[PDB]
Design a binder for this molecule. Structure first.
Ligand SMILES: *[C@H](C)[C@H]1/C(=C/c2[nH]c(/C=C3N=C(/C=C4\NC(=O)C(CC)=C4C)C(C)=C\3CCC(=O)O)c(CCC(=O)O)c2C)NC(=O)[C@@H]1C
Ligand SMILES: *[C@H](C)[C@H]1/C(=C/c2[nH]c(/C=C3N=C(/C=C4\NC(=O)C(CC)=C4C)C(C)=C\3CCC(=O)O)c(CCC(=O)O)c2C)NC(=O)[C@@H]1C
Ligand SMILES: *[C@H](C)[C@H]1/C(=C/c2[nH]c(/C=C3N=C(/C=C4\NC(=O)C(CC)=C4C)C(C)=C\3CCC(=O)O)c(CCC(=O)O)c2C)NC(=O)[C@@H]1C
Ligand SMILES: *[C@H](C)[C@H]1/C(=C/c2[nH]c(/C=C3N=C(/C=C4\NC(=O)C(CC)=C4C)C(C)=C\3CCC(=O)O)c(CCC(=O)O)c2C)NC(=O)[C@@H]1C
Ligand SMILES: *[C@H](C)[C@H]1/C(=C/c2[nH]c(/C=C3N=C(/C=C4\NC(=O)C(CC)=C4C)C(C)=C\3CCC(=O)O)c(CCC(=O)O)c2C)NC(=O)[C@@H]1C
Ligand SMILES: *[C@H](C)[C@H]1/C(=C/c2[nH]c(/C=C3N=C(/C=C4\NC(=O)C(CC)=C4C)C(C)=C\3CCC(=O)O)c(CCC(=O)O)c2C)NC(=O)[C@@H]1C
Ligand SMILES: *[C@H](C)[C@H]1/C(=C/c2[nH]c(/C=C3N=C(/C=C4\NC(=O)C(CC)=C4C)C(C)=C\3CCC(=O)O)c(CCC(=O)O)c2C)NC(=O)[C@@H]1C
Ligand SMILES: *[C@H](C)[C@H]1/C(=C/c2[nH]c(/C=C3N=C(/C=C4\NC(=O)C(CC)=C4C)C(C)=C\3CCC(=O)O)c(CCC(=O)O)c2C)NC(=O)[C@@H]1C
Ligand SMILES: *[C@H](C)[C@H]1/C(=C/c2[nH]c(/C=C3N=C(/C=C4\NC(=O)C(CC)=C4C)C(C)=C\3CCC(=O)O)c(CCC(=O)O)c2C)NC(=O)[C@@H]1C
Ligand SMILES: *[C@H](C)[C@H]1/C(=C/c2[nH]c(/C=C3N=C(/C=C4\NC(=O)C(CC)=C4C)C(C)=C\3CCC(=O)O)c(CCC(=O)O)c2C)NC(=O)[C@@H]1C
Ligand SMILES: CCC1=C(C)/C(=C/C2=NC(=C\c3[nH]c(/C=C4\NC(=O)[C@H](C)[C@H]4CC)c(C)c3CCC(=O)O)/C(CCC(=O)O)=C2C)NC1=O
Lengths: 193, 160, 48, 48, 161, 159, 161, 159, 161, 161, 161
């Protein structure tokens, strides 16, 4: 983890929130399971190091890696002898609240997605539902003069799904005078430009 | 998590309000109920194993699921379903104490339909099993605390 | 319902171990081509 | 209505941020009834 | 959206169960509350303009917001803010009749934070306005109605914050 | 339900509920208790209503329960009766709601498409619903029957 | 979309190379398969309604899905599911004629997973239905055609899962 | 709150709540009514507590309200008093909760960082909280004061 | 993953049926092929490095890919491509022993398309390489083994394309 | 990440071209700017705490955000916001030394918008803070350095918005 | 969009200040420059086709881009690239008349980077083309006009990069 090889392969190409999620998967075999843990770890990697006498660079991302190996959950399950293994459907049960995300984290395509998946999911549960096409974030075209530019699922995975019923209505911003908007007044389009 | 005391607090801090009598009333209410909720929880813990078994019998058992080509079929599958019924009970009890529904959905409801659809588990059956747990629980609990205990069960049912 | 969905993943668990699978799964974890010994173990399994 | 040709009536929040957001928000997002020291020091120099 | 009557129906429909006495009792409970709710709604509709006026006077106006450089400065922005206030009031009234908070989630609450952030509208001030409306509404509706009315107003406030 | 319908119309108009609309809501809440009783009656008689209606339908349409026909065979006949039961449950839901909307979303949208894939004849299904109406009407008191009839008629119209 | 013939052409065009014998051989291979494919397509079109019916019977119906609380419960949902099934069949037929999987990616496969997740439609069940359609189709088309037909069905299944 | 803490420990152990844990919950619910009164008292006296504490603090530390000092000027002095008010509100929340956790999340985590950016001296803030405690203690009865003191002490310790 | 034997068993288990003789015959067929499969697997393992070399020579090298600006340009990329080739070979061998294509779907085929698209690896060239490996493998294994080996190679190719 | 020197090298490497005078001139240009950049970086590091303080004072503090119900309300959130500000400053300094915007894209920019939207952090306010930091930084660094510093700050702002 | 005159007005309006001499001076500065700008705009419009031709000749054509496998290979892509070039020219002319860069941000610059990345259009080459157009434009407009014209071209270039 501290090695030069481990960064640049991981860490250097990701944003810090994504690095802590991959570092979960490979060091502990689980996905990150809650909002409070992805916060504790985000503060470790974020925190400027206390100056360390050991030439081995102090904390930083190294702190992240320490905190994981030094964790009781780590040491207990793996022990000192075992190499970490991926816990999975067969072993250790596997929780429901992170299921979809975790199974994506376990696949080898995981390092291809660059947007953080765990922080978005946690706290998307606490928030009201987003401003997006019902059928998905990818279904909204980019808004530019000419051209239809969508995000493609394969070329870089960044899916955001949200459950939006038949009844839900999008909030749209009027291009024009705000009081023209037809939600608050039905006759607003038949008004002066 | 969030429980009835801390819920009232949390609504007040976002407004920046000190605690009002209106808030103090909601808090009093919890404290009145609380004493028997503690009693009802102990009843449910003791009889839990029995409660599950009765519930399974009423709905899950003697269903298509038990027959081969159903989820209940096999000892392995049967065991899993029981674990799930035990899950639903602990949480509902945890929810009964505290008195806030949210503990439920953070720990149970969030993601459940997605796992179940992935595993192939039938959602409707689980809902039936939960409703069964509710009736058994109510009898053990007794009538006054039953209204309380039924709420958390119903939340779980509509969540699924 | 929930505010957010992580999504659904088609996952299949293993009902019963089989000798066929058990040998393969060891090979994959090793990331090695079929070892000399197991090859002999497999064909007796095929004949028997 | 048979004589106007269609025009762009509405747009989504993300579309709106694309056009206007470069350079972000100018303003301090003032609130009612807030103690703020903003503008005080300038007013003192204008007086002097 | 959903209402109390439909909520009961939907729960039974997923079970596939015919309506039963226990279900009927829940429906009956709603029906008793209904008369009060209808009276409250009529009060709110008649006094809607005033409710908004009073609430704005309490929080929004005579403030930095209305002064130049404030979000509610300029006629266009002022008019928008009072339009938003009206929305909140109308939806809360709908919710109170329904007896369910779902409509608020489906129409008002969904994507509001994001919209406001792009617009640069201040959320905390808006929440303040909603709370002010609640207080005014509470008076007009009277105590029994006020409790029911308050929950929907609080729901909106919690969503936005 | 009535209330949902009223709210929806108001929201489209972007107005508060009209006094007239409010009055209709008031009338509905008063009617509800009577409506609950009507629904209860049909629920109790449900098993017999379905059975009687089924027999009538099969007499009216010999073909459906014939080797060519969809209904033919025990499995198929059971499914046909199950469908009749479903529609009755929907009708009860409608009576308590005071609107056909609950009925409509569960049963009447995409019904044509579903039955066409199944190859079930839609007119025969309609006849079954008509048959159920007649049985239900007999058990209900006259004024109660009229209320129930409206919901039954809607179903028949929809298919 | 793209087909086999155009795929070869496009690969050569980016190279700027004139068509060569090796390229011609690939084209020739397609031409032999072509006649079989045309016959298969006609069979599928004529039996499309039945294919869907049989596949539904094999997997979707008489199941928890159709029972209350299941995804395909209610007429509206049932109709939606069979509409989706038809889509898959039509596109697979197109792909089989084309000899290229690309059309499936461009039309069907792109964004389907995300749509399904938002809807709460179960992917595994859908995959099951696709596999069922394949089996029915295999029978009707006959063995030579079946091999070709199967790959496109499998492609759809892999994409969804 | 006490109850949340107990539930969380149980969930970690994956067990139903222990009898001992249940007993502590029982004790807490009995204590709650007394706690509510203590909180109510402080809320009513809030305005005076803040005022008195502020004066004491400014006497103890002339520097903070001096041209060099952060607190100096009307605007700044108001903000300093607002901060004291915030901490008092947090203390009341704590008393009803029976735990410092509510206090801790809102006020004690990141407090050092926030004040360091502001350049406000942390020790002065602590003195203000101590001052508030003394005022609060006087209004409260002795036993009530002891309960309140614990929460006040925690704040002082945290800063 | 799944194997041929287990696939048959699972189908029977859902039916609840004891194994039919016809089913048994299919299992019996597999058991005879298994001896030949084991021999083929040993051949492939011993000649794996050469198989990859030959296939690369046939398609990948002396090409634009290897030339600067090509996907397989630079040592790092070249090494990656041959590593991928080895994966395909190893998994195909596993599939041949198993008698089932499922393992390919579960490990290799799942997520490959997405990985490749992000990387900008060309799928058609990869498919070409797989086909080349198949041809080389066919020679070494001998005719009876070749037919069995070919199906898994073709399965991989169809998945990628 | 990439730097100006490496960017030139990489462009040549894809072409396969040896380094040429025109390329050398770009490298030479960077080398002259380098000394200024190093001085600017040292200034920023020493004054980082103050820069953040001043910028917060200009935009964030004394606002709805800090008021209850605002995003930066509570100590925890306040601390988070200033931590984010520090990140932006540190990365901009890195970019300025490098002479390339790429590091900002690779670490800061990628996925931040989505994260913020889920969190409900207001992007426009954050952008405002970045712009404020730029202004403060401009003063300290001095004019020659300021132009260079400004581009990276603007790059961050454009990415977020 | 916004123009220099409106920009001054807007800045004063948020302050609430009446127009002052300092503000007047900025307005006066614009008015003097105005006549030159109008002449420059007419020159650009008349020579637009040639400007694009010359710039393409300098950078785009006779290059790998135009050669097979290059982004601007095929007539369709070539036509698209020159259409984009025309857009940039027209918008820069608009900006020059306006005296404000805002229109570029609102129409051209928003989402362009993302669009280009999805398309696989090379940003650096595009930037090169813009710079080439600037040089050609500079000649035609003449020196006084050139300085004004250059800033808008540079603004576009900075946005893209
Ligand atoms: C009683 C002396 C005799 C008897 C009858 C019997 N069985 C059950 C219940 C179950 N039996 C099973 C069956 C199996 N599942 C497996 O995995 C295996 C191993 C291959 C078997 C045989 C199971 C799972 C149950 C429980 C639920 C179910 O009905 O499927 C009962 C009733 C108990 C109950 O309802 O839990 C009875 C009376 N079995 C014998 O062999 C005895 C001679
Ligand atoms: C004077 C001829 C008339 C008059 C005026 C009057 N106005 C108010 C209060 C406000 N007026 C405004 C108006 C503006 N704000 C804007 O943004 C603009 C455009 C730039 C305008 C014109 C505002 C915002 C207010 C609200 C209060 C505030 O200052 O925030 C009042 C008193 C408030 C009240 O009505 O109670 C009055 C009296 N009154 C007359 O009768 C004259 C004809
Ligand atoms: C009033 C208390 C605050 C305020 C409001 C304000 N809002 C806008 C603009 C919009 N408000 C909305 C909001 C909604 N539309 C919906 O459909 C819903 C749910 C039913 C809501 C709540 C919208 C979308 C707009 C913008 C576009 C449009 O209206 O069509 C503004 C105007 C901002 C501008 O410049 O456009 C204002 C000022 N601002 C305050 O300061 C108050 C605290
Ligand atoms: C009886 C009046 C007629 C008839 C009925 C018939 N139905 C089926 C099969 C199905 N019918 C349904 C219908 C519904 N599902 C719903 O969710 C609802 C609303 C709540 C309805 C109305 C469904 C889903 C099925 C499929 C089976 C299943 O659910 O698992 C059959 C059998 C069709 C077959 O051949 O498989 C029959 C016979 N047939 C007639 O002709 C009568 C007039
Ligand atoms: C008073 C005892 C000391 C003092 C206070 C002081 N504070 C500020 C400014 C702020 N203080 C806060 C603090 C809080 N916000 C929170 O969310 C919480 C927890 C609920 C607290 C305690 C904040 C946010 C600010 C920033 C300004 C704002 O309100 O937006 C100041 C002035 C800041 C300045 O330096 O200009 C002062 C003076 N200063 C002392 O010296 C006293 C000892
Ligand atoms: C010369 C010192 C020795 C030698 C050379 C040799 N090389 C090849 C074939 C290839 N060489 C490369 C190497 C590179 N590609 C890169 O991207 C880089 C880094 C920039 C290098 C160094 C490649 C890719 C090939 C494959 C063919 C191709 O270019 O497409 C051969 C040909 C032999 C063969 O193809 O098997 C030879 C002879 N070999 C010796 O004997 C010398 C000692
Ligand atoms: C070779 C035939 C073609 C080719 C290959 C190529 N692949 C990569 C990089 C990766 N390939 C994979 C794929 C897999 N990982 C797995 O686990 C499996 C299934 C068992 C596969 C097939 C992965 C994950 C990577 C990235 C990891 C890594 O470090 O390699 C490259 C390098 C691309 C780059 O620039 O990084 C290449 C070149 N490309 C060709 O040109 C051939 C047609
Ligand atoms: C300050 C100018 C504004 C602000 C900031 C703010 N951010 C958070 C929380 C988080 N910020 C991040 C973002 C990053 N992840 C990365 O990888 C990087 C680049 C290296 C950044 C900047 C993350 C991951 C979080 C979540 C972590 C956590 O929850 O502790 C908050 C707190 C929000 C909350 O609900 O906790 C805040 C306040 N928001 C404002 O109001 C300012 C305009
Ligand atoms: C010959 C019959 C006529 C003729 C040709 C001519 N062409 C150019 C320059 C270019 N020609 C092309 C055309 C194409 N590029 C494509 O992608 C396609 C389709 C695949 C075509 C047909 C291009 C791109 C160029 C630009 C330069 C380049 O090749 O990169 C010229 C030179 C133009 C100049 O003035 O520089 C000429 C002369 N000219 C005639 O008059 C003949 C009748
Ligand atoms: C020319 C110097 C370079 C070049 C350009 C190029 N662009 C495209 C395709 C598109 N260009 C755009 C761009 C815009 N859409 C907008 O709304 C705006 C602002 C007004 C711009 C500038 C779009 C959206 C497209 C796609 C849709 C369309 O073309 O109508 C291409 C063709 C790509 C394709 O595959 O179609 C090209 C070639 N390419 C180069 O290599 C030059 C460096
Ligand atoms: C704390 C909240 C929570 C829940 C609820 C949960 C559910 C849950 N149910 C699971 C499995 C399972 N769940 C069931 C359950 C049932 N099948 C039926 O038909 C019945 C109706 C039903 C119960 C009565 C079965 C059968 C499995 C095994 C999957 C299979 O192989 O079919 C699994 C997979 C874990 C494993 O078995 O290793 C999870 C995650 N996990 C959690 O963390």
């Amino acid at each position: 983890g501290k090695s030069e090889l481990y960064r640049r392969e991981f860490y250097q190409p990701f944003i810090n929130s994504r690095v802590l999620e991959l570092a979960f998967k490979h060091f502990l075999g689980r996905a990150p399971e809650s909002r409070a843990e992805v916060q504790k770890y985000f503060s470790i990697i974020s925190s400027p190091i206390v100056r360390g006498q050991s030439s081995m660079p102090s904390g930083g991302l190294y702190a992240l890696i320490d905190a994981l190996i030094d964790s009781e959950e780590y040491t207990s399950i793996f022990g000192e002898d075992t190499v970490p293994y991926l816990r999975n459907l067969g072993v250790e049960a596997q929780p429901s609240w992170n299921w979809g995300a975790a199974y994506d984290l376990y696949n080898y395509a995981a390092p291809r997605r660059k947007v953080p998946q765990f922080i978005t999911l946690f706290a998307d549960y606490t928030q009201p539902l987003p401003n997006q096409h019902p059928y998905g974030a990818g279904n909204d075209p980019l808004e530019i003069q000419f051209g239809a530019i969508f995000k493609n699922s394969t070329i870089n995975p960044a899916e955001r799904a949200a459950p939006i019923g038949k009844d839900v209505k999008r909030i749209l911003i009027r291009n024009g005078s705000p009081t023209s908007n037809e939600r608050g007044n039905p006759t607003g389009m038949s008004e002066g430009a | 998590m969030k429980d009835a005391i801390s819920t009232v607090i949390a609504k007040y801090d976002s407004q920046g309000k000190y605690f009002d009598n209106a808030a103090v009333d909601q808090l009093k209410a919890y404290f009145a109920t609380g004493e028997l909720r503690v009693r009802s929880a102990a009843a449910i813990s003791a009889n839990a194993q029995s409660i599950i078994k009765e519930a399974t019998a009423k709905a899950l058992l003697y269903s298509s699921l038990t027959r081969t080509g159903g989820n209940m079929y096999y000892a392995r599958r049967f065991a899993a379903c029981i674990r799930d019924m035990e899950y639903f009970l602990r949480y509902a009890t945890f929810a009964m104490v505290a008195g806030d529904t949210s503990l439920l959905d953070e720990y149970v409801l969030n993601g459940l339909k997605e796992t179940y659809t992935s595993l192939g588990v039938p959602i409707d059956a689980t809902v039936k099993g939960i409703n069964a747990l509710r009736e058994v629980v109510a009898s053990v609990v007794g009538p006054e605390a039953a209204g309380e205990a039924s709420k958390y069960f119903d939340h779980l049912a509509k969540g699924l | 319902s929930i505010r957010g969905t992580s999504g659904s993943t088609v996952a299949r668990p293993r009902l019963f171990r089989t000798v066929m699978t058990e040998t393969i799964n060891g090979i994959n974890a090793e990331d090695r081509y079929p070892n000399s010994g197991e090859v002999s173990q497999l064909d007796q399994f095929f004949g028997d | 209505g048979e004589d106007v040709l269609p025009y762009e009536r509405y747009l989504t929040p993300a579309g709106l941020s694309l056009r206007k957001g470069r350079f972000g928000s100018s303003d301090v997002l003032t609130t009612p009834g807030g103690i703020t020291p903003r503008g005080d020091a300038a007013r003192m120099m204008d007086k002097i | 959206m959903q209402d109390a009557i439909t909520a009961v129906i939907n729960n039974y429909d997923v079970q596939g169960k015919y309506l039963d006495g226990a279900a009927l009792d829940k429906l009956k409970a709603y029906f008793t509350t209904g008369a009060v709710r209808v009276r409250a709604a009529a009060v709110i509709s008649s006094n809607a303009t005033t409710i908004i006026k009073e609430a704005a006077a309490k929080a929004l106006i005579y403030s930095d917001l209305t002064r130049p450089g404030g979000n509610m400065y300029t006629t266009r922005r002022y008019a928008a803010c009072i339009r938003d206030m009206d929305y909140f009031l109308r939806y809360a009234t709908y919710a109170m009749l329904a007896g369910d908070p779902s409509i608020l989630d489906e129409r008002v609450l969904n994507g509001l934070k994001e919209t406001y952030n792009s617009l640069g509208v201040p959320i905390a001030a808006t929440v303040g306005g909603i709370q002010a409306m609640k207080e005014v509404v509470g008076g007009l509706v009277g105590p029994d109605a006020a409790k029911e009315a308050s929950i929907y107003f609080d729901y909106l406030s919690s969503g936005l914050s | 339900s009535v209330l949902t319908k009223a709210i929806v119309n108001a929201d489209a108009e972007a107005r508060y509920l009209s006094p007239g609309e409010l009055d209709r809501i008031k009338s509905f809440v008063a009617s509800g208790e009577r409506r609950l009783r009507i629904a209860q009656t049909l629920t109790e008689a449900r098993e017999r209503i379905v059975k009687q209606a089924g027999d009538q339908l099969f007499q009216k349409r010999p073909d459906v329960v014939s080797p060519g026909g969809n209904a033919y065979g025990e499995k198929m006949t059971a499914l046909c009766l199950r469908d009749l039961d479903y529609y009755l449950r929907l009708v009860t839901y409608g009576i308590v709601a005071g609107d056909v909307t609950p009925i409509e979303e569960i049963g009447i949208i995409g019904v044509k498409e579903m039955y066409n894939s199944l190859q079930t004849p839609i007119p025969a299904v309609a006849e079954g619903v008509r048959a159920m109406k007649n049985v239900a009407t007999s058990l209900l008191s006259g004024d109660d029957a009229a209320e129930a009839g409206f919901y039954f008629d809607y179903l028949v119209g929809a298919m």
